[PDB]
Design a binder for these strands. Structure first.
Ligand SMILES: COc1cc(NS(C)(=O)=O)ccc1Nc1c2ccccc2nc2ccccc12
Ligand SMILES: COc1cc(NS(C)(=O)=O)ccc1Nc1c2ccccc2nc2ccccc12
Ligand SMILES: [Mg+2]
Ligand SMILES: [Mg+2]
Lengths: 778, 778
DNA sequence: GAGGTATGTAGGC
DNA sequence: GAGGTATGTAGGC
DNA sequence: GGCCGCCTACATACCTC
DNA sequence: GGCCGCCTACATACCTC
């Protein structure tokens, strides 16, 4: 087996005293290599002897769904391992390394004495992923196959400190493990002074002195897993065929460990499996839900919104083209993406992809290069080393307003600003965008709607001139949903049909019996048209019904001809029995594609919310835009009144400076006192000019006090009469804007109605422009 | 064979009409994939048929040195292919793809008709590497094995445009190929207006419309190689056992192609092999010489100096730690490194490595993580994903002064600033640093000298108080070299000895015949101590002379014990015959390590210069520092006189502003006219405050004219009397500094003598501090 | 005696 | 009739 | 995130005939 | 720069007895 170092005196007379170290990644492998090669000054410290090495290679499969538990009626319960589980390299490799056998149950001392290694230790990163997932699946598999090993403490793991705080003059850290504990320690402390906080989001982040200190006390910080009676049901709920069973368990939320339990764990290293599954595995599942379910407001996931934030920050200064990996590094460093690089590049490529049938109907990035056509479904995209991506500045600026991004709540990472909780847009992307995301307890499926029914719905909800406005409000208060919603017909030459409670997509075809050609210019919108012909190449008896398949379908279009026997038309017609909803030729070509919508979405707080129809999503997204417009108009009015009073103060100072003669003053304090005695209000102009996402109450309590830096910072060029006239004109313009804002807040329906109408018009104009081109605005 | 797409109708009746495309990298493979899958609207455009696909995988082996040409005395000349050439995957794979055989010579039509492909086309990037090297080796191998194929035009290649200039309103570019041609076109044009210049430093940089335009005229831009009578000697000189033969050919320089030759090439696509070898291969060889041979002044290579420039730029704002790949991306994007990423990361790791026997005696980066110990010679360094590097700010600032970097000449990349031509330091790194770099025609070997002989030499050359100053100057004018130079003893417990004209390094050992232990605490300075014991494990008859080898050598130290037979001492002593220069035990342990110095260095212009001894390097490096100090002092004096006159003007304006009353003025022009009529000189303060590497003549001709932006840009806070007093004190301080500079220019030996002495003292203090620690300054 | 074999490096592809 | 097999996506590894 | 081939320059055992 | 394993959720032929 590869990546397995055979330790000396292992699998022999001293095998029971040996230990085995399991690594989730090569970083842990390197850390273990350094620890083993340390050697000197470590008598109790484990050298390469009795240690060995095995790497889990990242994420391994769980045998809960692989087993079948068939033919248990013979009086004994036997589990048959599926061939998909048997041939996995990692699982059989670790089985061979341990020398264990599936059939035997190690209840007595000798049975576990035959094991090659006395114990197995799992060494993973302290981030939310890995511990809880990799440990979770590993020990769940161990419990499912050999519960006695967990019962007798054969399996164990080492627990590294996630966060360390070092005090100057002292050589020992706090070595805290959970972020809740670190927050409690920070808040219980009088102040965060004389302390250095170190974050270890990965084992390889530790230094040489850190790893040597860990290996000096390697006998400590190693915890043995203990099995309880209640662990079996937790394992079945968290892992297994039962899907809805874990839904009701995830919908509640993580329960923090009690103080007495933590004290017991720290005193003696016996970690129960139930507590680990309830804390670490549940937290990992919740994190996966958050990171894979797009927020209904954004219609896009956390990684996608972080990518959008990085693109907005990078391309704001210059819209010049940037390569994929440069942008990935930029968004990783600036926006604190501590997961990886390949996943980030893949997500960027998927977001920038644009072709008929693609997941992104309105990509946020204008891509240059070979992103792949509809034929491979984006699988034939080029390498990230050379693919070029640039931001769609017009579409983003008409779809995600700058002020809206200013007032959005932000996620704080290590006390620093990061991507907002949700980019609530002028139009809900959860409706336009569509994709299939299976997320650790829920499935996310969507189908695009036409940008005519939703536009009419929003216009009626906003514009009071629409006769359906009152009717739409009645529908809002009574869930009537008078206006219809239909699947988007863009980039689809077929016809959509509705039967019962499900929509269906049909391609178009032409039949020429004189030459026996089966032309299919249109095919279902989501099939890649290449895996489709592969499926039709394995379509059972249709091999005798056809001769061969020829593909002339190029990019941007589909055209496929099917060779078939001259006597095949009648037999396929009499065999397929065309129904009232689908054609016999459609059945032969599998042109029918039933579409299902699983509207599983996360609330801005972080909880799963389900929607029966898109109308619920729209009616839940609307009030957020209402509140954001109201608060944005209020903040604009407040900052404009501060700006106008500040500009009036500056103008009065410029007028009075002819006889003020402030040059004959000693320091800044004397000038400030003189100008205060002259009646000038002190304003923090560094906050007035650039509010920088300041709420109303905090902006007011910051503008109550201030300083005369605005007066003392103006140059010797702004005192000219031309500058004074320009400032007076700006005063008049901003006063007119303030009056316009004030009268906008007084409209009957709701604040910011005409603003929303203008934003809708601008964004639909930009969308139409992008439709006319191939999303390349040049 | 992998990465080989089998084209339809290939190797059959229509095989002679097929073509084969050879790609140097996967980027070219992807471009060819896009071109082949384009298909439609291209009747003459080649589809997947008759094309195939093969990859060269970048650099391949050259058969010129692999062949032996043995047993040619039988009346026929036969070349025996070495097994190292036969088992190469790429070579045998392409041989199998073509279906050719080594024994047969294809002179007639049928012999080349048996070939699977009618012709072979090499598709590589248009940068200096690839075309000239990959093409060079490929067609040299083809000529060496089958000259008739080149004679009959079997081998060919496609030539892509390196630089394209697009004119607005026109759809055709200039599609220029060589940078000389592009420069000639730019200089012959009246102006660079209404033109967009696009650089393609790689095939994948081309866009979809670019590649479709190329494939529309794929019949063009394909050039067939023609063999001449003189090509054989060029092939032998450029490739083969003859080493010195290519030295005299590289020492001359590249000869540009004549206009008539270029016109003939463009008119009919028959590229001679001699012209290609003389231009592209020679330019690639010169580029390799420049990029591999370290500049004698710098003591480091072009990539290393670009890395240092990137580190200086990145860490100047903040000395915070940065990961390896973030820094690599930063230096690639900012400093225009268009080669790759893995090589850059490897170079960064090698530069940041610090251990006994390492190449870098004074690393410019303070590294955090596992860079590897002396045992593996840096081969056990960790992954770049997690290795931490930070700049040694104190060492760099005391070794590479900021003003010196200001006045250094810079390399211009695409009209933008890049790394300087040479970082001439306060002490020549070519002496302290040492490494083994084989560079495409020359070998670079160095051995470190003690930082006591060179320090004394520089002090005597600089300080006039040293009694050897006049003697050292006499040596300079007469090559006497009175002062000695000895190998550095740092991190080496052994003793250096000199015999004849070569130094020798010996380790130390202890013998205890009572217990038969062979202890070796010290070993030669450059052997990795792990490959050494591997060599001694294959050391012929010494297997019978020993029993086994045990290694307790940890990091930072070496201790090895050798098990040997009790009756082995006398027999090894009587077998090895200890000489007067090395011991019998030293011979048994191979403790003697003869050191050779190949002082092959590139001039700042770019030419190879050889040095017989380190004294020549020192005496050539000294005048550069002399000139830089002289010009730096002159520039400082000039910029200081401009600064003092500007500050005096500002102070006079502040004094006069009490009664000036400039507020009653209309625009900036009126104020400028008034202040000019008041006698204020107009100075470009944006150049006076920050000169930004301005030469004396250009600084003077820029300071002759100017504007009153300095007067009009000062804020309303600098007019206080405290600011006036502070400015007066600054005036006095800079006047004193100007007087000090003026008296420094008048010292008898040379300008900047005491400055050099102080810089030497500071840099040696910093070096001593780094010696006391493990190059970790905390 | 003569010939053939194997890394060893940096900066590359 | 019943059971077993194979992707098919987006982020993670 | 790490398994495949060398390029150019070149002191050096080698070991069983 | 691209070959290896899946994780979670789940409409769906299937085909020869
Ligand atoms: C189990 O996962 C892996 C196994 C191997 N080796 S083997 C025995 O299957 O030949 C190699 C890699 C992996 N895991 C992978 C990743 C792990 C972490 C992060 C990214 C990964 N990306 C992978 C992509 C393809 C295949 C395996 C990957
Ligand atoms: C000859 O070089 C290569 C061959 C192959 N394939 S094969 C036919 O030998 O099985 C694959 C790759 C290469 N070349 C390599 C590289 C090429 C460009 C850039 C980096 C490369 N890094 C390599 C690292 C190891 C081995 C080959 C590499
Ligand atoms: Mg991790
Ligand atoms: Mg290249």
């Amino acid at each position: 087996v590869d990546k397995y170092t055979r330790a000396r005196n292992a699998g022999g007379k001293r095998a029971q005293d040996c230990m085995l170290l399991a690594a989730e990644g090569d970083s842990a492998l390197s850390l273990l290599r350094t620890g083993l090669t340390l050697g000197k000054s470590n008598p109790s410290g484990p050298s390469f002897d009795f240690c060995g090495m095995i790497s889990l290679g990242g994420v391994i499969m769980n045998a809960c769904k692989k087993v079948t538990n068939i033919t248990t009626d013979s009086g004994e319960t036997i589990m048959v391992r599926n061939e998909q589980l048997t041939n996995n390299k990692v699982l059989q490799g670790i089985v061979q390394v341990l020398g264990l056998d599936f059939n035997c149950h190690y209840k007595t001392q000798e049975e576990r004495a035959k094991l090659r290694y006395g114990c197995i230790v799992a060494c993973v990163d302290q981030d939310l992923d890995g511990c809880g997932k990799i440990l979770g699946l590993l020990l769940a598999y161990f419990h499912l196959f050999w519960p006695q090993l967990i019962i007798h403490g054969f399996v164990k793991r080492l627990l590294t400190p996630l966060i360390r705080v070092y005090e100057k003059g002292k050589t020992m850290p706090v070595e805290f493990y959970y972020e809740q504990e670190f927050d409690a320690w920070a808040k219980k402390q009088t102040s965060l002074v004389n302390h250095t906080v170190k974050y270890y989001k990965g084992l390889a982040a530790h230094d040489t002195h850190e790893v040597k200190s860990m290996f000096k006390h390697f006998d400590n910080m190693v915890y043995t897993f203990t099995l309880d009676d209640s662990a079996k049901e937790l394992f079945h709920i968290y892992f297994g065929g039962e899907s809805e069973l874990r839904k009701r368990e995830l919908c509640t939320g993580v329960v923090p460990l009690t103080e007495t339990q933590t004290q017991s764990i720290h005193s003696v290293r016996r970690i129960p499996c139930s507590l680990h599954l309830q804390v670490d595995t549940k937290a990992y599942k919740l994190d996966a839900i958050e990171r894979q379910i797009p927020n209904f407001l954004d219609g896009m996931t956390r990684a996608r919104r972080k990518i959008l934030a990085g693109g907005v920050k990078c391309f704001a200064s210059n819209n010049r083209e940037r390569k994929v990996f440069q942008f990935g590094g930029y968004v990783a460093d600036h926006m604190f993406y501590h997961h990886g690089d390949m996943s980030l590049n893949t997500s960027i490529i998927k977001a920038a992809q644009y072709y008929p049938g693609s997941s992104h109907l309105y990509p946020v990035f204008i891509g240059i290069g070979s992103f792949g056509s509809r034929h491979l479904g984006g699988k034939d995209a080029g390498s990230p080393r050379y693919i070029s991506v640039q931001l769609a500045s017009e579409f983003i600026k008409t779809m995600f307003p700058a002020e809206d991004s200013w007032l959005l709540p932000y996620v704080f990472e290590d006390g620093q600003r990061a991507e907002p909780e949700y980019y609530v847009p002028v139009l809900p992307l959860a409706i336009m965008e569509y994709g299939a995301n299976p997320s650790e307890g829920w499935k996310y499926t969507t189908w695009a709607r036409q940008l005519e029914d939703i536009l009419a719905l929003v216009r009626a909800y906003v514009d009071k001139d629409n006769p359906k406005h009152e009717l739409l409000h009645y529908a809002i208060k009574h869930k009537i949903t008078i206006l219809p919603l239909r699947p988007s017909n863009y980039n689809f030459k077929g016809h959509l049909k509705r039967f019962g409670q499900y929509y269906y997509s049909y391609g178009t075809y032409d039949i020429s019996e004189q030459r026996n050609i089966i032309t299919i210019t249109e095919l279902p919108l989501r099939v890649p048209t290449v895996a489709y012909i592969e499926s039709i190449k394995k379509s059972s008896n249709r091999m005798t019904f056809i001769e061969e398949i020829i593909d002339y379908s190029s990019s941007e279009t589909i055209e496929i001809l099917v060779k078939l026997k001259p006597n095949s038309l009648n037999r396929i017609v009499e065999e397929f029995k065309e129904t009232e909803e689908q054609d016999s030729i459609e059945n032969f070509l599998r042109l029918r594609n039933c579409l299902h919508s699983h509207l599983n979405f996360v609330k801005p707080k972080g909880g799963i919310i389900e929607f029966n129809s898109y109308y619920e999503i729209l009616y839940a997204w609307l009030p957020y835009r209402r509140e954001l417009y109201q608060k944005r108009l209020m903040r604009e009015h407040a900052v404009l009144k501060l700006r106008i009073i500040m500009e009036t103060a500056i103008v009065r100072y410029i007028n009075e400076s002819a006889e003020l003669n402030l040059s004959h003053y000693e320091d800044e304090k004397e000038a400030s006192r003189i100008l205060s005695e002259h009646g000038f209000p002190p304003l923090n102009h560094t906050l007035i000019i650039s509010p920088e996402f300041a709420s109303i109450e905090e902006l007011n309590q910051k503008a109550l006090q201030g300083c005369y830096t605005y007066i003392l910072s103006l140059q010797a060029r702004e005192l000219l009469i031309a500058a004074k006239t320009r400032r007076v004109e700006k005063i008049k313009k901003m006063q007119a804007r303030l009056d316009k804002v004030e009268q906008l807040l007084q409209e009957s329906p709701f604040p910011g109605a005409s603003v929303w109408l203008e934003e809708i018009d601008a964004v639909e104009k930009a969308i139409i422009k992008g439709r006319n081109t191939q999303w390349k605005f040049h």
